[PDB]
């Protein structure tokens, strides 16, 4: 299973010396299997029988085929989605940069956008460590 | 130690440890996708 195709396949073989089965005669006919049937090959003497079965499902579907995308207005700091603009409430609304207490991480600032949809492509977390008298204190790098 | 025995504790020193997260990523879809019919093909043989 993949984007672009389906496949399901499945094969049965099988292998018997069913020779002796074919070395058969036919007293009701007065006729022989070989004969009767008018086969030679595999039944005047039976051999090694095979029963070779192939079962072969195969389905095409296009990869992007209908779909469906929401609007999306990349830019190097952001992503913008134009959603909905409704009117209703407040266009939008900053957050300011806050100092978590006891801490040294940094919220970095954002601005929320309503009437379209704004995501900021990278956030900044600051560093921070735990401060404690000779126990083990976790020191985090900033990660973005 | 000292205040029952008179022997004193080996000294035991816990170095700086560095503590590895793995890298996460969470997907969100941006859009569906409806493969569209192309073609549909069965097959089946016995062979005796």
């Known amino acids: ?144 | 130690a000292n205040k029952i025995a008179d022997f004193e504790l080996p000294t035991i020193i816990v170095p700086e440890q560095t503590i590895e997260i793995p890298s996460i990523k969470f997907s969100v879809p941006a859009g569906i996708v409806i493969p569209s019919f192309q073609a549909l093909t069965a097959r089946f043989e016995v062979d005796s």
């Open chain 1, 1 to 144: 299973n993949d984007q672009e195709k389906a496949h399901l396949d499945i094969a049965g073989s099988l292998e018997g010396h069913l020779r002796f089965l074919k070395n058969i005669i036919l007293p009701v006919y007065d006729k022989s299997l070989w004969d009767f049937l008018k086969l030679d090959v595999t039944t005047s003497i039976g051999r090694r029988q095979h029963l070779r079965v192939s079962t072969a499902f195969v389905y095409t579907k296009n990869p992007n085929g209908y779909s469906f995308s929401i609007p999306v207005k990349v830019l190097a700091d952001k992503f913008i989605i134009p959603g909905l603009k409704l009117n209703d409430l407040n266009s939008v609304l900053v957050m300011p940069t806050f100092h978590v207490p006891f801490t040294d991480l940094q919220v970095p600032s954002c601005k929320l956008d309503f009437r379209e949809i704004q995501i900021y492509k990278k956030l900044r977390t600051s560093s921070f460590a735990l401060n404690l008298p000779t126990l083990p204190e976790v020191k985090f790098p900033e990660v973005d």
